[PDB]
From a paper:
The 8mer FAKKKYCL and FVKKKYCL control peptides were also synthesized. Comparisons of FA and FV 20mers with their corresponding FA (pink) and FV (green) 8mers show that 8mer peptides adopt nearly identical bound conformations and that P1 is the most divergent position in both 20/8mer pairs, with shifts in Cα-atom of 3.13-Å for FAs and 1.42-Å for FVs. In contrast, the canonical structures of FA and FV 8mers showed very similar networks of interactions and exhibited identical Tm values, 71.1 °C for FA 8mer and 71.4 °C for FV 8mer. Finally, it is worth noting that there are two water molecules in pocket A of the 8mer structures. The simulations revealed that 1. interaction between P1 and Tyr59 is characterized by the more stable T-shaped π-π configuration in FA and FV 8mer complexes relative to FA and FV 20mer complexes, which is consistent with residues 54-59 being ordered in the 8mer structures but disordered in the 20mer structures; and 2.
Antigen presentation by major histocompatibility class I (MHC I) molecules is central to adaptive immunity.
Numbering used by the authors:
A (entry chain B): 0 to 99
B (entry chain A): 1 to 275
C (entry chain C): 2 to 9
Write the structure that this text describes.
């Protein structure tokens, strides 16, 4: 059928401050069909109990989902989003960079 | 300003894993107010906006009945569509639907919508006249003939011009503190050297609602459309949205670049520069 | 408010 590769952004809800509670977001969009695997990682390990939005789509029919968790960033902890989709041969990892 | 109500429905077959999943999500602008998922274990616990709870239990009952009937209708649709494309019983397929209304600041109907896509491809649409169909292919022509014979467009018209407009106006009134409030973007420009020779200027818009925004860079007052990296507008999770736009500039030329921000919550459009 | 759908 059609397949469309997801676009991935990783970012915080609020401007990041080391030691301050916040939300880490992974926004997957532009994809088709709808099945997709999304993990949030802390120092390479899967975060548990990550929540996500209800499946919806843009007016071009491409799906989007937000995955999110509460987190307290530090100078040293690494965060990322790991996404798999039928259009990806290997899972795609996007690192959290507080400047993007 | 202007407003929309839209339902986004997805039906997805999954042979050997039960009946097709049906999910319907309803929005006013960029605010979700209802969800119905056939895979929810507790329909009674499915999210509803607060300005919905106020309508009471008979409203909930009537909407639940329509969502339940829609589940069965979209499963009927998927079975028919597999046949119209000569498809095998083995594959998973997707049927999407969008329906709803656009109104102006006065609450008058601007237009209605009722359209479908199958496996990502536009299939059929109700025309702007709310009387006639556009079918993408000879499969959708079957649907069109069926819907013409059954006078379906007249039913959809009555919903779009009546129920949809009337309830969108009632939701805007009940939810006026949020739905009718535009939150302007919080804006700044950052500077990221890439080498001795160049740097990235990134113009940020944070905390805005609704999601529609225009964010552009100009060099000496010329649009830099081709040379700008514009990321998709993204949800923060607190109802608001974020966006940025970046350009690569030669070292020492930063003051020739201006970022321009248009948004409904701004009393006036912004012009920003680095520092 | 949801709309009754019709089979394709």
């Amino acid at each position: 059928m059609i397949q469309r590769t997801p676009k991935i952004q990783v970012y915080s809800r609020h401007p990041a401050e080391n030691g301050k509670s916040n939300f880490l977001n992974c926004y997957v969009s532009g994809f088709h069909p709808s099945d997709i695997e999304v993990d949030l990682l802390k120092n390479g390990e899967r975060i548990e109990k990550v929540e996500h939005s209800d499946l919806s789509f843009s007016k071009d029919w491409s799906f989007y989902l937000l995955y999110y968790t509460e987190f307290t960033p530090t100078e040293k902890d690494e965060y990322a989003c790991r996404v798999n989709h039928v259009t990806l041969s290997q899972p795609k990892i996007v690192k959290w960079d507080r400047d993007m | 300003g202007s407003h929309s109500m839209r339902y986004f429905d997805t039906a997805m077959s999954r042979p050997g894993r039960g009946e097709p999943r049906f999910i319907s999500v309803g929005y006013v602008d960029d605010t979700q107010f209802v969800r119905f998922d056939s895979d929810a274990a507790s329909p009674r616990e499915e999210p509803r906006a607060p300005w919905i709870e106020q309508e009471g239990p008979e409203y909930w009952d009537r909407n639940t009945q329509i969502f339940k009937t829609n589940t069965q209708t979209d499963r009927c649709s998927l079975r028919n569509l597999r046949g119209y494309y000569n498809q095998s019983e083995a594959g998973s397929h997707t049927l999407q639907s969008m329906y709803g209304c656009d109104v102006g600041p006065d609450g008058r109907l601007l237009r209605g919508h009722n359209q479908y896509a199958y496996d990502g491809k536009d299939y059929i649409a109700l025309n702007e006249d709310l009387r006639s169909w556009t079918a993408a292919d000879t499969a959708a022509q079957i649907t069109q003939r069926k819907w013409e014979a059954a006078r379906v467009a007249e039913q959809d018209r009555a919903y779009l011009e009546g129920t949809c407009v009337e309830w969108l106006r009632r939701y805007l009134e009940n939810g006026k503190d949020t739905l009718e409030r535009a939150d302007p973007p919080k804006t700044h420009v950052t500077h990221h050297p890439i080498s001795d020779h160049e740097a990235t200027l990134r113009c940020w818009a944070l905390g805005f609602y609704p999601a529609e925004i225009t964010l552009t860079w100009q060099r000496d007052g010329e649009d830099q459309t081709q040379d700008t990296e514009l990321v998709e507008t993204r949800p923060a999770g607190d109802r608001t949205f974020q966006k940025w736009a970046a350009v690569v500039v030669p070292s020492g030329e930063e003051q020739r670049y201006t970022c321009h921000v248009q948004h409904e919550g701004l009393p006036k459009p912004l012009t920003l520069r680095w520092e | 408010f949801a709309k009754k759908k019709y089979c394709l």
